[PDB]
C-alpha cells in the first residue's frame with residue numbers, strides 16, 4: 696500500500712530469490728517485486744514532499760522505478776526459461792540500483 700510497505704516487499708522478495716530452490720519460485724518473487732515497484736512509483740518520498748510533483752527530482756525518482764522494472768522483466772525472462780542460477784544472478788544486479796535511488800532520496 697504505502698511506500699515503506701512496497702520497500703519491504705522489494706527487500707523481502709529479494710531474499711526469497713536468493714534462497715530459492717527453483718526458477719518458478721524466483722518468478723513468483725519477481726512478480727511481487729514488479730507490482731511493488733510500480734506501486735512505489737506513484738508515491739512521493741518524504742525527502743521530496745516539498746518539491747513540485749512535476750520537478751526533475753520527482754521525475755528522476757519515478758524513472759528509477761522504470762529502470763528497476765526493466766531489470767525485473769529481464770530476470771523474469773530467465774526465470775521463465777527455468778534458468779534458476781542465471782535469474783538469481785540477474786536479481787542481484789538490482790541492488791546497485793536500489794542503492795543509487797536511496798543515496799538520493801531515502
Ligand code: HEC
Nearest residue numbers: 698699702705706740756759760763789792793796800801
Ligand atoms: C527509488 C527509485 C528507489 C528504488 C529503485 C528503491 N528504493 Fe528502497 N526506498 C526508496 C525511498 C525513497 C525510501 C524511503 C521511504 C520512506 O518512506 O522513508 C526507501 C526505503 C527502503 C527501505 C526501508 C523502508 C522502511 O523500512 O521503511 C528498504 C528496506 C528498501 N528501500 C529496499 C529497497 C530494495 C531492496 C530495492 C531494490 C530491489 C529498493 N529499495 C529500491 C526509494 C527507492
Ligand SMILES: [Co+2]
Nearest residue numbers: 762766788792
Ligand atoms: Co541497470
